Subunit: 413 residues, 3 copies
């Protein structure tokens, strides 16, 4: 069965304390990967579910509260750019979508061992708070309620067509020669193009040059975007961090403030002409008019009224008229639609789960059930892959992909 | 007719300035009883409607702004625990759901005498504000936006199955022998069990021992619950107190703050797996996964989006597939469902009215009309009783029950 | 075609920098007229669209940030009361609905010239902020989140039946004799009655006597109303001003505060018995129970939940059972309904557009399309008039009316 197979991927990809996203392709600990993977471990061993998160904070979190996107636990030649490019166990210098508090809330509420639950939640609570504080300190200096990402890897959706025009401004002059390693594990046509990677590395070198100084990175990055996905996830995490606080009887401090200001911000990203949520390019000072599946994530946050949810429900159904499987990462009628190339079209299991949870909350039971059925069927037929063709259902990207197996286990719990 | 009969109960139960909930059974002034009863008096004599509330504050409200749940106006042997157990005219040392500002808002808006309206509203406004302030001072020291009740009588829903596990922790060692008086007026099978009353009194003695000190009561009570009902009622009252302020041109001070923070809090009580609002046990640090009719009360508050209201509408309809009359106080499929025993199943007229008002606001006209029709039919056939069997419609609890007659008059105005 | 004809009205009514609402009838610059008219100019010449707003601020805005309702650019005998009555280029001493930031947001987002866009938006941003600040300073001293208008011209809906009882209190003793000029350009039966104008002038003379002192005007005006229209427009403008700030990377200062407090306030105006939003009379301290088309404007603001939008959708459909064209300015079953007299029944193109945009946002596509079709058909058959008979579709009020032509061009863009 699906579940038995799912467990084996998690056990094979386990390195003891953390779980790699994929053998070789992703030989390190990733931030939002580890959060979703923790949910899967709840179906195998709770102790080890918590452990995934403890390892993430204990080895990942810097003194300023920043949680980086990769914790480079063990040497490897299989991944670029590795610790030596970042030049800092070693970690990357950027962050990823802060889905962790949401995952911590579920672990806390549902652990059968209530003494363990409380120990781990009290231990992680202030660390969560420091992470969110770093986000607003580093990425929201005008106190807007929205946070910027300074690198498209921080969205978790690396080559999303929303980032194309923002990335066009990143200078690519006199970059060191590098050899990519991802294309040894995955077909190149399924990964970002070199123009993309040149720009990904140019940003990393600007950041390393500026010594990963939050203030300077913000001032000088040629890439500054209010990602609808990162911010919807953050609004959701804030609401779950608030719940934790009240349940644990901790001082919620300024969490309420984050929530209230975040709600004004997240709903500002709505474009009434297009009937969709867009990420914003702050360098250009404009909305990025590109409908990606991150634009559904405010449903996960719970900020929209029913009428906006309705309009999103209608949009997903339209995408379903072309795509055999929901939910493709970009409008399949988009000129940028590429049904096999990463975040430019393929279906992803984690986004399916989030958007489904979201639609369920707003009463769209049939659509939420379609997203679940599509996810499970894709995984029944092609195993646990990083993403899938929305037209054909063909597995793409990483094989033995940990969060696919984790969410399969979680969603069928 | 129903209305003529309703008036007579109010006139018979009137003690001049206040109205008892029921002759003998409840021979004193109750807090949320008197608020709903005031609405009924609006259909007989407005002066006397206001008077109900004036008496409540003038004789009930302590120096710290606390409004207690019982004002022990006249000696009686018919009720236990009476003023001498509480040991403090005398009052109890605990509060009840703060529905009063909402009732004060209606009285103010609708009194045909506009000079009276303004006198009474200006007189009561600062007293209302002090009451709410006491709530946040005594019961929300971490400034969460949610307030705890420290005793299940404070919910107004004394033996709700949500309180069972919280109550299990209340020590019952070496309690004085007492004789219950409620079971002289009502069948025992319709009232709380002795295990319940032992625990109710143990909490009262801890509170009397700690001299009803808000700070110590909060720190030491073995019972600490965020009641969804108390807090939904409080959110609604806050919004109505804000309206009063603007209408009277009074400084709303921190009411906005209460409303904004309260809205974050009340919506945190939603459990997405169960599709329902739960009260929270802060001693255990967990949601209490028990669906009671208090979980519908956020509709009265107006905080949910339409999708949550939808899911609640679906839940009420399911309860209606078993129960002949809506709205039973607990899911009729609950293992704790007891169709005659107080707040563990019976239908209540005040909760019917609140939940109906709530569903009406969210567009569920048919369900709201069903709740009204059910309430009025129950009262047509069995008179004005405290609660009713949801299966058979048989009258239960107190006879000549004042808020049933009051709401009957109000709801058919 | 409609569009070609629309352009000619704007070019004929253009005085170079600003556009008059109507030749002769309205020979000056009006505040909310110029905002809607700017949207029309976007379909002809963007430079000139911006210019409309620049002229409004550069010549209109006082040192305290107040934006007045009329900028009296050029001498004329065609209008009363003109600059010499106000006694202050000259301007009036009162304001109008602050729809400007919303219009500025659209201009900014859509200007094909991105350098121009940024210049104009950065230039106008702090001026917008000062205008809103003046509103809260002058008109919200208790920091309610709602602002009062002190004169029914400030609503933009001069003789709305909601103002009748508030106006009844304005003293009309020993007023100077005046001659009205509006009735030279428009049938008197289509304009306000003399009892109205006596009261309009009495307020202007009290204000001129008190030297247009914000503090004294607020304390002494016999007319003080929380207009649902002005405040819904302001909530919408605040949300758009917030968007601008984030897009421009300007410090949003207290805009979030305005939005959060404004949302509590605007939703307090909802009357659950009537199923509608009412303006409030603060002199009487009561809701004004009169359903006008301003009561739909919270849909433009985006504050209601779907259930209130639903109830409003049902109300508009009822009004449509009597009225051949939506949306009449007052419930056609109202005893105050006058199908030709200004804001007491006629259909208006700007309110149609706003309420349609609003219903679209809440998923009421059919109703929004009806409002648009009705607007365009009214303008196809009777040209561009100030308002129209909802029963017959007959043109009323000003001829060659600028915002009708502007919105016709805009809405068919
Ligand atoms: Cl909603």
């Amino acid at each position: 069965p699906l579940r038995t197979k799912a467990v084996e991927v998690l056990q094979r990809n386990s390195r003891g304390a953390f779980t790699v996203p994929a053998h070789g392709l992703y030989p390190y600990q990733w931030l939002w990967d580890s959060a979703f993977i923790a949910l899967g471990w709840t179906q195998v061993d709770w102790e080890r579910a918590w452990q995934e998160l403890l390892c993430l904070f204990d080895y990942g979190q810097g003194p300023d509260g920043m949680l980086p996107h990769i914790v480079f636990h063990e040497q490897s030649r299989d991944y670029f750019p590795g610790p030596d490019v970042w030049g800092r166990p070693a970690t990357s210098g950027i962050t990823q979508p802060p889905v962790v508090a949401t995952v911590v809330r579920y672990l806390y509420e549902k652990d059968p061992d209530r003494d363990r639950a409380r120990e781990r939640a009290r231990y992680l609570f202030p660390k969560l708070l420091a992470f969110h504080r770093w986000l607003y300190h580093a990425r929201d200096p005008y106190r807007t309620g929205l946070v910027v990402i300074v690198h498209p890897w921080e969205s978790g959706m690396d080559n999303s067509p929303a980032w194309d025009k923002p990335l066009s401004r990143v200078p690519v002059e006199n970059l060191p020669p590098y050899e990519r390693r991802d294309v040894k594990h995955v077909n190149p046509e399924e990964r970002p193009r070199k123009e993309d990677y040149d720009r990904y590395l140019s940003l990393l070198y600007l950041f390393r040059r500026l010594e990963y100084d939050p203030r300077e990175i913000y001032r000088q990055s040629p890439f500054k975007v209010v990602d609808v996905g990162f911010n919807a996830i953050l609004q959701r995490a804030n609401r779950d961090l608030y719940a934790l606080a009240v349940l644990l009887q901790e001082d919620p401090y300024e969490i309420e403030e984050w929530i209230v200001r975040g709600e004004v911000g997240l709903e500002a990203l709505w474009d009434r002409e297009a009937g969709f949520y867009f990420s914003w390019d702050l360098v250009a000072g404009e909305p990025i008019a590109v409908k990606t599946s991150a634009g559904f994530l405010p449903l996960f946050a719970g900020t929209p009224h029913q009428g906006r949810a309705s309009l999103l429900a209608q949009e997903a159904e339209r995408w379903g008229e072309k795509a055999r499987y929901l939910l493709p990462s970009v409008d399949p009628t988009s000129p940028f639609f590429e049904p096999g190339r990463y975040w430019r079209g393929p279906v992803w299991i984690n986004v399916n789960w989030m958007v489904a949870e979201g639609f369920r909350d707003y009463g769209f039971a049939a659509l939420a059930a379609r997203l679940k059925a599509d996810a499970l069927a894709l995984m029944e037929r092609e195993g646990f892959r990083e993403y899938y063709d929305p037209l054909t259902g063909q597995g793409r990207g990483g094989e033995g992909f940990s969060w696919s197996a984790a969410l399969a286990l979680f969603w069928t719990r």
